[PDB]
Point group: C2
Chain length 228, copies 2
């Protein structure tokens, strides 16, 4: 069928595994069969590696995400990222991925192609964040989250000069979630920068977009200073 | 003896009651004896009302605080406010009161007398906050907290033109606690204003006090709009 059906089928199989309905061998067989039905051979070999017990579910998910990035399947990428952030106990990152997925679905139904590359770059950043979390290395997580906040700053700057309003609310929600994540990570300066960007976005949405820019360059210099 | 030891004795009695070591009759008798020893008759009658069972511990604490406000005892005021905010399960307000007590204790050992009036006004605002919380009326709590944030903003504006450094850290911590309180109350705009003031204070303390003023009028304008 179409690439949208494959993503939904794979996602459903993964939720069945995660909820405890099926086990690892059943999941491997089902997902390998689904990939074989659609002609995706490399994904099939990656799942075969799980069927042999060489790798685990998390490593298989990471390799599947890399292969889908090489191939260019977007809905499968979102499904795999949600599964990765659900295997690791982080609901906030799953919420961020969900909001990004809704933004991508809104963007693809119109002619907006500039936001697509920015969403792809943020997907790369989220993938690196997940990889760093799997490595239990907390120092790179903060830097990657700072890069993600800068990318959201770029997108909100682009969107303010346009008439988009739902994008503003979604970016505000995402920035609030990252601020909570930073607070839970024992950091206060990066949380303050994220909340500054969120406040600027809210001010621009309200109607007072004259005061937003001062906050905007203030937050960007703070973010640039804190990365180094 | 001196009023400093009276507050310590009363506070120790109240913590003994709160920890479950002594009961209400024992606490009433002990506190009435302490007040009678130091010659405070009105406080003794207020405690006598508790001994007769007419009022409860929280009501007695409220009337004791009002009587101490009329008399002008500061350490007793702080003790009574901490007891009030401990009877109501709000550790964050107790932390705010503790930081205010440290601020007042630092101020009294030097010649700073202008901060005393503002600390007294903030104590009045905190007393109103406690009264509103006891009434379970959540709408006035947010407005009173907004007034408290405005007072803290005025104090940080006064302190920035001076050379104090620990003070700025103290308003920063207080404002962060108030922002957490606002977030837990299901509000986002007032929390954003409190975090804006805290960020301005942090920036001024760091050394870049030129960027803090824009934040200062932005936050104060937002607070003024949100109060009405
Ligand atoms: Zn096979
Ligand atoms: Zn802070
Ligand atoms: Zn008596
Ligand atoms: Zn917000």
């Amino acid at each position: 069928g179409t690439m949208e059906e494959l993503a939904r089928r794979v996602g459903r199989a993964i939720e069945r595994y995660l909820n405890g309905e099926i086990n690892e061998v059943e999941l491997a067989l089902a997902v390998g069969h689904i990939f074989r039905d659609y002609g995706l051979e490399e994904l099939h070999e990656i799942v075969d590696r799980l069927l042999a017990g060489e790798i685990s579910v998390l490593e298989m998910l990471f390799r599947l995400y890399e292969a889908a990035v090489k191939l260019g399947l977007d809905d499968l990428k979102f499904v795999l990222l949600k599964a990765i952030f659900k295997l690791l106990n982080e609901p906030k990152m799953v919420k961020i991925v969900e909001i990004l997925e809704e933004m991508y679905k809104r963007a693809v139904k119109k002619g907006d192609e500039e936001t697509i590359k920015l969403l792809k770059e943020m997907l790369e950043v989220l993938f690196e964040i997940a990889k760093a979390i799997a490595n239990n290395d907390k120092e790179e997580v903060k830097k990657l989250l700072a890069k993600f906040v800068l990318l959201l700053l770029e997108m909100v700057k682009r969107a303010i000069k346009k008439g988009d309003k739902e994008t503003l609310k979604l970016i505000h929600e995402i920035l609030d979630i990252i601020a909570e994540i930073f607070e839970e990570l024992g950091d206060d300066e990066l949380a303050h920068a994220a909340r500054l960007v969120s406040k600027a976005a809210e001010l621009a949405l309200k109607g007072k977009k004259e005061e937003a820019e001062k906050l905007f360059e203030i937050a960007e210099e703070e973010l640039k200073e804190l990365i180094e």
